[PDB]
Amino acid sequence: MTIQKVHGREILDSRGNPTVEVEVTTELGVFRSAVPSGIHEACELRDDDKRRYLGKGCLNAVKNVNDVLAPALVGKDELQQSTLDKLMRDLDGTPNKSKLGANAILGCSMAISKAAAARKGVPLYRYLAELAGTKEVRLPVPCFNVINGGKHAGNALPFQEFMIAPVKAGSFNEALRMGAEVYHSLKSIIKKKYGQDAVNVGDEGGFAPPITDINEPLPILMEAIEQAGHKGRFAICMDSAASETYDENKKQYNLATWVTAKQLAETYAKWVSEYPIVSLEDPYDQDDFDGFAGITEALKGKAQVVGDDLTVTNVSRIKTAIEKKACNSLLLKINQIGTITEAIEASKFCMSNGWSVMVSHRSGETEDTYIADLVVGLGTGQIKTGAPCRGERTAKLNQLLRIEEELGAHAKFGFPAWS
Ligand SMILES: [Mg+2]
């Protein structure tokens, strides 16, 4: 009835860096989970041996799975998520998981929950829904990354992510096709205006064209949506990652074109007014609680404001945020917090304070599909997991089709407020 084996191994992620994979064995099978990788987050433990993988090795985190966590988990009842997640946190002993590593622990937490789902005779998403007390599961609207700027692209583009989202789709099956078609349509446009080389892809599968006009990107997307055949069925999500353009010293942002926060809101207003933008992620710096707060009010009813760097999937950052009424949407990254029980706790807490929850990949991913099940089981209606391109992104989109098939034609889709 109990856990029989727990093992860790180092594997490669989608950009060629090591990460941690864990298998939990029971009489029911071998349950396998891998950890993704992207100040206030749970510690990701690396070996910093410069002779292996440029310091990025995961031997120590693996050793910690096999030598500390495993002997502690063998002989236990994998059904007990909360209890085992606490035992693992108490084994590390530190508030940020910096002795054993969040990458050692999360892998255990995930795989345990999968063994537990088998034990209960239900698919993983049904099991997660129960642990989360989700009243209705649903398939999420996929927010696909299609155009890159900021620290990723050598573009004149300053902001990190433009995303398209098939909010008027009727199912996930249709959403994925819609997203795909606009993607090919986008590539086509971009290749017309910039050339073959310009449509090669970033880490998350979208494009990094050499655009030069801060106003040329949003309309490219509108053009790709029409050419795809889906005029008026898509919305737009941004991720500014504003921290990356900011001076703690100059108190301003460098869009060198330096501008105020007051002034930078003028830009966000002109875009949400013009374009069907429904979500704005990290519009200001990760400590600009007041800059966040104002734009959130300004955009009440038009677009959600989503904390990523702001909230770092961290309860005490989230409570800070709720006090200052700084955002109303949490980016949810399981490996920033480190256990499934906490991640679920964080989701319940934001939702119960009136926030949405966008479940998210990391820029370093694996063929793992856990988050497809999580986002369904949490019922958030929103996921960000890549362009419809690159296997570490598409494995998630595919898992979502599988889940929707299993749910049957009754199965619910998307984010109501965007539908
Ligand atoms: Mg971000």
CA 411/CA 168 separation, integer angstroms? 16
The reply to whether 216 sits in an annotated binding site is: no
Q: Could you tell me which CATH number the domain at 122-417 has?
A: 3.20.20.120
User: C-alpha angle with apex 113: 110 to 117, nearest 5 degrees?
Assistant: 140
How many beta carbons lie within 10 A of that of residue 194, not counting itself? 14
* CA atoms within 13 A of residue 85's CA, in its CB half-sphere: 22
3-state SS of 324-348? CCCCCEEEECHHHHCCHHHHHHHHH
Instruction: Give me ligand 1 centre to Cα 310, in Å.
Output: 9
Q: Residue 290, annotated ligand binder?
A: no
Q: Which of 346, 360, 353 is nearest to 327 (CA)?
A: 353
Residue length, the chain?
Answer: 419
User: What's the one-letter identity of residue 160?
Assistant: Q
- Residue 228: closest CA among 272, 276, 280, 175: 175
**Side-chain half-sphere of 131: how many Cα atoms within 13 Å?**
34
What's the sign of the alpha-carbon dihedral 329, 332, 337, 340? positive
Between CA 308 and CA 311 the distance in angstroms is 6
Q: What is d(CA 143, CA 141) in angstroms, rounded to the nearest whole number?
A: 6
CB atoms within 10 A of CB 52: 14
What's the token pair of residue 285?
């710096």
Residues 371/360, Cβ–Cβ less than 8 Å? yes
Q: Which residues are CB-neighbours of 263 under 8 A, at least 6 positions away?
A: none
CB of 126 within 8 A of CB of 357? no
In this structure, what token pair is assigned to residue 37? 């990788």
Q: Strand, helix or coil at 258?
A: strand
- Helices then strands, each counted (H, E), the chain: 14, 14
Is 40 assigned to a binding site? no
Candidates 350, 375, 417, 336; CA nearest to 36 is: 336
In whole angstroms, give the CA distance from residue 269 to residue 266.
Answer: 5
Residue indicated by tokens 């929103």? 382
Question: Contacts for 118-124 with beta carbons within 8 Å, 24 or more apart?
Answer: 118/26, 118/28, 118/29, 118/31, 119/26, 119/28, 119/78, 119/79, 120/79, 123/373, 123/403, 123/406, 124/370, 124/373, 124/377
Residue 93 in contact with residue 29, Cβ under 8 Å? no
Closest CA to 68 of 101, 35, 96, 26: 101
HSE at residue 149, side-chain half, CA atoms within 13 A, is 25
- CA torsion 246→164→205→280, rounded to 10°? 20
- Which residues neighbour 287 within 8 Å (Cβ) at sequence distance 6 or greater? none
In DSSP notation, 199-254 reads: G-B-TTS-B------TTSHHHHHHHHHHHHT-TTT-EEEEE--GGGGB-TTT-SEE
239 C-alpha vs ligand 1 centroid, how far in Å? 6
Q: Which of 402, 345, 267 is nearest to 109 (CA)?
A: 345
Residue 362 assigned ligand-binding role: yes
Residue closest to 268 by CA, chosen among 282, 286, 248, 247: 282
- What strand order describes the sheet that includes 5-12? 5-12, 18-26, 29-34
Residue 126, helix vs strand vs coil = helix
Tell how far the Cα of 282 is from the centroid of ligand 1, in angstroms: 6
Q: How far apart are CA 70 and CA 312, in angstroms?
A: 28
Q: 40: exposed, middle or buried (C-beta count within 10 Å: 0-12, 13-18, 19+)?
A: middle
Q: Is 266 exposed, middle or buried (0-12, 13-18, 19+ CB in 10 A)?
A: exposed
The residue to which tokens 């690396």 are assigned: 46
Alpha-carbon distance 156 to 213, whole Å? Answer: 7
Sign of CA dihedral 61, 361, 242, 16: positive
Q: What are phi and psi of 278, to 5 degrees?
A: -110, -10
Check: CB of residue 197 under 8 Å from CB of residue 188. no
DSSP annotation of 65 reads I
Query: Is 239 annotated in some ligand binding site?
Result: yes
**Alpha-carbon span 11 to 34, nearest angstrom:** 8
**Token pair of 377, please?**
């089981």
Round to whole Å and give the CA distance between 397 and 366.
Answer: 13
The H-assigned helical ranges of 37-80 are 59-64, 70-73
171 carries a ligand binding annotation = no
- Token code pair at residue 266: 């003028």
Provide the pairing of β-strand 235-239 with 277-281: parallel
User: Where in the chain are the domains?
Assistant: 2-121, 122-417
How many whole angstroms from 281 Cα to the centroid of ligand 1? 7
The residues, any chain, with a CB within 8 Å of residue 268's CB and separated by 6 or more, are 280, 283, 295, 298, 299
Residue 368 near residue 34, CB atoms below 8 Å: yes
Which residues have a Cβ under 8 Å from the Cβ of 246 and sit 6 or more positions away? 252, 253, 254, 285, 288
CATH topology for 2-121 is Enolase-like; domain 1 (3.30.390)
360 carries a ligand binding annotation: yes
Please give the Cα distance from 262 to 178 (Å, whole number): 36
Cα of 246 from ligand 1 centre, angstroms: 15
Q: How far is the CA of 223 from the centre of ligand 1 (A)?
A: 25
DSSP codes joined into one string, 371-390 = HHHHHHHHT-SEEE---S-S
**Cα–ligand 1 centroid distance for 242 (angstroms):** 9
Residue pair 362/337 in contact (Cβ under 8 Å)? The answer is no
Q: How far is CA 77 from CA 83, 118, 410, in A?
A: 10, 12, 34
Catalytic machinery residues: 204, 333
Query: What CA–CA distance (Å, rounded) separates 314 from 333?
Result: 10
Q: CA-based angle 264:268:270, to the nearest 5?
A: 110
CB 340 within 8 A of CB 113: yes
